[PDB]
């Protein structure tokens, strides 16, 4: 496929998720943001790693899509196929 995108699972649906209200508070906090977003979720343990990779991977999807897709042609028909 391609580039659609490329969420990341964990890192991208809880970053983007949060990096924005962590980067704002400061407005460049990030040092702080990447860490409030670090640790709480190594904190955590699988509950929120774990899932947080859920998030964006049940995201990942859409974007591995537009990718494949192309690729897809069939990856679309003869996989790609549909192709069942």
């Known amino acids: 496929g391609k580039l659609p995108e490329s969420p990341k699972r964990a890192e991208e649906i809880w970053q983007q998720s949060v990096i924005g209200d962590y980067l704002a508070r400061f407005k460049n906090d990030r040092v702080k943001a990447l860490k409030a977003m670090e640790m709480t979720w190594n904190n955590m343990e699988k509950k929120e790693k774990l899932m947080w ?18 690729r897809a042609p069939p990856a679309a028909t003869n996989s790609s196929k549909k192709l069942e």
């Open 53 to 70: 990779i859920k998030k964006a991977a049940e995201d990942q999807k859409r974007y591995e899509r537009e990718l494949s897709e192309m």
